[PDB]
Amino acid sequence: NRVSTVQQLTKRFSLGMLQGRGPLKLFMALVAFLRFLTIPPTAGILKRWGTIKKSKAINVLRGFRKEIGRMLNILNRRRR
Amino acid sequence: NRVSTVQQLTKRFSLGMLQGRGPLKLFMALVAFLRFLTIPPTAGILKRWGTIKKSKAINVLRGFRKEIGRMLNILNRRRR
């Protein structure tokens, strides 16, 4: 269908993001995962890509960068 | 169970990774996603955390950093 996959974040973001929300990563994290294995952005991913806030998405992607650096702090203390 | 979730990458990494594989992100991407929403690393995630290669995982996490920067190149060209 290339469009019935973004429905999940379309029903979860009913009232929140544009208002404030908290994490707002659930959407980026999901599409990013698929974007890391096959990059199959359904229709909603693109149509919603240019109709959200960006300030929160870009900040979220920035937090993901800090979250990945933290993962290294986890795989860098194994000692052996 | 806190252990029957890593089984998926345990059956997919049967013969590869230590040999060469290709992406080897499927594992980090999955645990990373959960690590971005609730950080529920099952038993395997930890026991396997200190018994893999790290050079490939760290390189994978580095590729994820380049993949996220690319996502911005996508959410920075919307114009409006």
PDB file of C-alpha atoms in Angstrom:
ATOM      1  CA  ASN A   1       0.000   0.000   0.000  1.00  0.00           C
ATOM      2  CA  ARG A   2       2.974   2.345   0.633  1.00  0.00           C
ATOM      3  CA  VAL A   3       0.760   4.471   2.933  1.00  0.00           C
ATOM      4  CA  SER A   4      -0.980   2.232   5.534  1.00  0.00           C
ATOM      5  CA  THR A   5       2.292   1.988   7.540  1.00  0.00           C
ATOM      6  CA  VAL A   6       2.464   5.629   8.729  1.00  0.00           C
ATOM      7  CA  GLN A   7      -1.103   5.229  10.062  1.00  0.00           C
ATOM      8  CA  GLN A   8       0.341   4.137  13.439  1.00  0.00           C
ATOM      9  CA  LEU A   9       2.070   7.507  14.090  1.00  0.00           C
ATOM     10  CA  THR A  10      -0.957   9.205  12.458  1.00  0.00           C
ATOM     11  CA  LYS A  11      -3.229   7.836  15.220  1.00  0.00           C
ATOM     12  CA  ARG A  12      -0.648   8.362  18.005  1.00  0.00           C
ATOM     13  CA  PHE A  13       0.074  12.035  17.126  1.00  0.00           C
ATOM     14  CA  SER A  14      -3.654  12.979  17.294  1.00  0.00           C
ATOM     15  CA  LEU A  15      -3.079  15.826  19.807  1.00  0.00           C
ATOM     16  CA  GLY A  16       0.476  16.536  21.069  1.00  0.00           C
ATOM     17  CA  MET A  17       3.438  17.272  18.710  1.00  0.00           C
ATOM     18  CA  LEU A  18       2.360  20.754  17.443  1.00  0.00           C
ATOM     19  CA  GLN A  19       1.352  21.462  21.078  1.00  0.00           C
ATOM     20  CA  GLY A  20       4.481  20.160  22.867  1.00  0.00           C
ATOM     21  CA  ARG A  21       4.440  16.352  23.377  1.00  0.00           C
ATOM     22  CA  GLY A  22       7.636  15.027  25.041  1.00  0.00           C
ATOM     23  CA  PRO A  23       9.835  12.684  23.009  1.00  0.00           C
ATOM     24  CA  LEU A  24       8.201  12.821  19.536  1.00  0.00           C
ATOM     25  CA  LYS A  25      10.939  10.362  18.481  1.00  0.00           C
ATOM     26  CA  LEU A  26       8.559   7.366  18.133  1.00  0.00           C
ATOM     27  CA  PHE A  27       7.881   8.586  14.556  1.00  0.00           C
ATOM     28  CA  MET A  28      11.481   9.336  13.515  1.00  0.00           C
ATOM     29  CA  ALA A  29      12.753   6.187  15.279  1.00  0.00           C
ATOM     30  CA  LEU A  30      10.301   3.962  13.346  1.00  0.00           C
ATOM     31  CA  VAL A  31      10.906   5.485   9.880  1.00  0.00           C
ATOM     32  CA  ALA A  32      14.659   5.743  10.670  1.00  0.00           C
ATOM     33  CA  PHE A  33      14.826   1.995  11.452  1.00  0.00           C
ATOM     34  CA  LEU A  34      13.196   1.118   8.114  1.00  0.00           C
ATOM     35  CA  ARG A  35      15.408   3.854   6.589  1.00  0.00           C
ATOM     36  CA  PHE A  36      18.417   1.950   7.989  1.00  0.00           C
ATOM     37  CA  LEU A  37      17.456  -1.439   6.478  1.00  0.00           C
ATOM     38  CA  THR A  38      15.605  -0.667   3.190  1.00  0.00           C
ATOM     39  CA  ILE A  39      14.464   3.013   3.244  1.00  0.00           C
ATOM     40  CA  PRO A  40      10.803   2.265   2.440  1.00  0.00           C
ATOM     41  CA  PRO A  41       9.239   5.611   3.493  1.00  0.00           C
ATOM     42  CA  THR A  42       5.479   5.106   2.983  1.00  0.00           C
ATOM     43  CA  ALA A  43       3.431   7.954   1.402  1.00  0.00           C
ATOM     44  CA  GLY A  44       2.679   9.530   4.821  1.00  0.00           C
ATOM     45  CA  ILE A  45       6.423   9.721   5.669  1.00  0.00           C
ATOM     46  CA  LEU A  46       6.982  12.080   2.693  1.00  0.00           C
ATOM     47  CA  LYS A  47       3.690  14.049   2.817  1.00  0.00           C
ATOM     48  CA  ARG A  48       4.200  14.447   6.588  1.00  0.00           C
ATOM     49  CA  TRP A  49       7.932  15.183   6.070  1.00  0.00           C
ATOM     50  CA  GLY A  50       7.060  18.715   4.844  1.00  0.00           C
ATOM     51  CA  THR A  51       4.129  19.546   7.165  1.00  0.00           C
ATOM     52  CA  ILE A  52       5.324  19.020  10.767  1.00  0.00           C
ATOM     53  CA  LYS A  53       7.655  21.181  12.929  1.00  0.00           C
ATOM     54  CA  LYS A  54      11.214  20.189  11.894  1.00  0.00           C
ATOM     55  CA  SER A  55      12.555  21.990  15.000  1.00  0.00           C
ATOM     56  CA  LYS A  56      11.398  19.008  17.077  1.00  0.00           C
ATOM     57  CA  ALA A  57      12.412  16.428  14.429  1.00  0.00           C
ATOM     58  CA  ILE A  58      15.884  17.942  13.956  1.00  0.00           C
ATOM     59  CA  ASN A  59      16.247  18.194  17.762  1.00  0.00           C
ATOM     60  CA  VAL A  60      15.076  14.563  17.969  1.00  0.00           C
ATOM     61  CA  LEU A  61      17.658  13.482  15.363  1.00  0.00           C
ATOM     62  CA  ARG A  62      20.204  15.410  17.454  1.00  0.00           C
ATOM     63  CA  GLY A  63      19.133  13.461  20.561  1.00  0.00           C
ATOM     64  CA  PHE A  64      19.504  10.243  18.532  1.00  0.00           C
ATOM     65  CA  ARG A  65      23.111  11.289  17.819  1.00  0.00           C
ATOM     66  CA  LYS A  66      23.660  11.661  21.581  1.00  0.00           C
ATOM     67  CA  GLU A  67      21.835   8.352  22.166  1.00  0.00           C
ATOM     68  CA  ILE A  68      24.160   6.570  19.705  1.00  0.00           C
ATOM     69  CA  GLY A  69      27.233   8.110  21.397  1.00  0.00           C
ATOM     70  CA  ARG A  70      25.843   6.734  24.663  1.00  0.00           C
ATOM     71  CA  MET A  71      25.546   3.270  23.065  1.00  0.00           C
ATOM     72  CA  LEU A  72      29.296   3.463  22.468  1.00  0.00           C
ATOM     73  CA  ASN A  73      29.840   4.326  26.141  1.00  0.00           C
ATOM     74  CA  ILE A  74      28.081   0.959  26.625  1.00  0.00           C
ATOM     75  CA  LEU A  75      30.121  -1.013  24.031  1.00  0.00           C
ATOM     76  CA  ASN A  76      33.386   0.707  25.090  1.00  0.00           C
ATOM     77  CA  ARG A  77      33.328  -0.373  28.774  1.00  0.00           C
ATOM     78  CA  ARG A  78      33.185  -4.150  28.099  1.00  0.00           C
ATOM     79  CA  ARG A  79      36.965  -4.279  28.838  1.00  0.00           C
ATOM     80  CA  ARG A  80      37.288  -7.663  27.059  1.00  0.00           C
TER      81      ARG A  80
ATOM     82  CA  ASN B   1      11.230 -13.359  29.334  1.00  0.00           C
ATOM     83  CA  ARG B   2      13.886 -10.628  28.862  1.00  0.00           C
ATOM     84  CA  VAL B   3      15.846 -12.981  26.553  1.00  0.00           C
ATOM     85  CA  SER B   4      13.529 -14.406  23.832  1.00  0.00           C
ATOM     86  CA  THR B   5      13.688 -11.072  21.922  1.00  0.00           C
ATOM     87  CA  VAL B   6      17.364 -11.237  20.851  1.00  0.00           C
ATOM     88  CA  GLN B   7      16.637 -14.705  19.392  1.00  0.00           C
ATOM     89  CA  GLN B   8      15.794 -13.066  16.032  1.00  0.00           C
ATOM     90  CA  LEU B   9      19.335 -11.660  15.519  1.00  0.00           C
ATOM     91  CA  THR B  10      20.678 -14.892  17.093  1.00  0.00           C
ATOM     92  CA  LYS B  11      19.139 -16.943  14.251  1.00  0.00           C
ATOM     93  CA  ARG B  12      20.036 -14.352  11.570  1.00  0.00           C
ATOM     94  CA  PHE B  13      23.728 -14.022  12.588  1.00  0.00           C
ATOM     95  CA  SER B  14      24.272 -17.823  12.331  1.00  0.00           C
ATOM     96  CA  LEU B  15      27.182 -17.586   9.841  1.00  0.00           C
ATOM     97  CA  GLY B  16      28.425 -14.049   9.089  1.00  0.00           C
ATOM     98  CA  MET B  17      29.526 -11.013  11.197  1.00  0.00           C
ATOM     99  CA  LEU B  18      32.789 -12.578  12.538  1.00  0.00           C
ATOM    100  CA  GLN B  19      33.406 -13.579   8.886  1.00  0.00           C
ATOM    101  CA  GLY B  20      32.423 -10.307   7.152  1.00  0.00           C
ATOM    102  CA  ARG B  21      28.646  -9.977   6.521  1.00  0.00           C
ATOM    103  CA  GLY B  22      27.718  -6.594   4.964  1.00  0.00           C
ATOM    104  CA  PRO B  23      25.550  -4.224   7.000  1.00  0.00           C
ATOM    105  CA  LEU B  24      25.408  -5.965  10.421  1.00  0.00           C
ATOM    106  CA  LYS B  25      23.216  -3.016  11.496  1.00  0.00           C
ATOM    107  CA  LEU B  26      19.986  -5.086  11.686  1.00  0.00           C
ATOM    108  CA  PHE B  27      21.020  -5.992  15.270  1.00  0.00           C
ATOM    109  CA  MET B  28      22.135  -2.533  16.455  1.00  0.00           C
ATOM    110  CA  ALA B  29      19.175  -0.884  14.676  1.00  0.00           C
ATOM    111  CA  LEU B  30      16.626  -3.149  16.431  1.00  0.00           C
ATOM    112  CA  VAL B  31      18.101  -2.794  19.949  1.00  0.00           C
ATOM    113  CA  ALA B  32      18.742   0.932  19.249  1.00  0.00           C
ATOM    114  CA  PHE B  33      15.050   1.504  18.404  1.00  0.00           C
ATOM    115  CA  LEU B  34      13.936  -0.127  21.669  1.00  0.00           C
ATOM    116  CA  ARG B  35      16.836   1.753  23.334  1.00  0.00           C
ATOM    117  CA  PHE B  36      15.286   4.977  21.979  1.00  0.00           C
ATOM    118  CA  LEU B  37      11.773   4.326  23.369  1.00  0.00           C
ATOM    119  CA  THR B  38      12.258   2.312  26.615  1.00  0.00           C
ATOM    120  CA  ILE B  39      15.807   0.805  26.624  1.00  0.00           C
ATOM    121  CA  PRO B  40      14.672  -2.782  27.295  1.00  0.00           C
ATOM    122  CA  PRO B  41      17.874  -4.657  26.301  1.00  0.00           C
ATOM    123  CA  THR B  42      16.965  -8.353  26.681  1.00  0.00           C
ATOM    124  CA  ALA B  43      19.536 -10.733  28.272  1.00  0.00           C
ATOM    125  CA  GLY B  44      21.139 -11.525  24.877  1.00  0.00           C
ATOM    126  CA  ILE B  45      21.719  -7.802  24.122  1.00  0.00           C
ATOM    127  CA  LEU B  46      24.012  -7.593  27.184  1.00  0.00           C
ATOM    128  CA  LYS B  47      25.651 -11.056  27.027  1.00  0.00           C
ATOM    129  CA  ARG B  48      26.231 -10.472  23.291  1.00  0.00           C
ATOM    130  CA  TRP B  49      27.314  -6.846  23.939  1.00  0.00           C
ATOM    131  CA  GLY B  50      30.700  -8.114  25.232  1.00  0.00           C
ATOM    132  CA  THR B  51      31.303 -11.047  22.846  1.00  0.00           C
ATOM    133  CA  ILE B  52      31.011  -9.701  19.273  1.00  0.00           C
ATOM    134  CA  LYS B  53      33.467  -7.548  17.245  1.00  0.00           C
ATOM    135  CA  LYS B  54      32.811  -3.936  18.359  1.00  0.00           C
ATOM    136  CA  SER B  55      34.834  -2.699  15.346  1.00  0.00           C
ATOM    137  CA  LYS B  56      31.813  -3.485  13.154  1.00  0.00           C
ATOM    138  CA  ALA B  57      29.270  -2.292  15.761  1.00  0.00           C
ATOM    139  CA  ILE B  58      31.109   0.995  16.379  1.00  0.00           C
ATOM    140  CA  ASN B  59      31.509   1.436  12.596  1.00  0.00           C
ATOM    141  CA  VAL B  60      27.788   0.638  12.268  1.00  0.00           C
ATOM    142  CA  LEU B  61      26.915   3.268  14.904  1.00  0.00           C
ATOM    143  CA  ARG B  62      29.152   5.652  12.941  1.00  0.00           C
ATOM    144  CA  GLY B  63      27.197   4.868   9.754  1.00  0.00           C
ATOM    145  CA  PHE B  64      23.976   5.514  11.709  1.00  0.00           C
ATOM    146  CA  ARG B  65      25.374   8.972  12.551  1.00  0.00           C
ATOM    147  CA  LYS B  66      25.892   9.566   8.816  1.00  0.00           C
ATOM    148  CA  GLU B  67      22.427   8.112   8.104  1.00  0.00           C
ATOM    149  CA  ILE B  68      20.808  10.541  10.577  1.00  0.00           C
ATOM    150  CA  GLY B  69      22.726  13.490   9.061  1.00  0.00           C
ATOM    151  CA  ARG B  70      21.321  12.354   5.706  1.00  0.00           C
ATOM    152  CA  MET B  71      17.790  12.364   7.181  1.00  0.00           C
ATOM    153  CA  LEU B  72      18.334  16.058   7.900  1.00  0.00           C
ATOM    154  CA  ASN B  73      19.386  16.590   4.280  1.00  0.00           C
ATOM    155  CA  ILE B  74      15.869  15.220   3.632  1.00  0.00           C
ATOM    156  CA  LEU B  75      14.023  17.373   6.227  1.00  0.00           C
ATOM    157  CA  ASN B  76      16.097  20.476   5.325  1.00  0.00           C
ATOM    158  CA  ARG B  77      15.124  20.628   1.615  1.00  0.00           C
ATOM    159  CA  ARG B  78      11.334  20.856   2.180  1.00  0.00           C
ATOM    160  CA  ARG B  79      11.615  24.649   1.556  1.00  0.00           C
ATOM    161  CA  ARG B  80       8.229  25.269   3.249  1.00  0.00           C
TER     162      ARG B  80
END
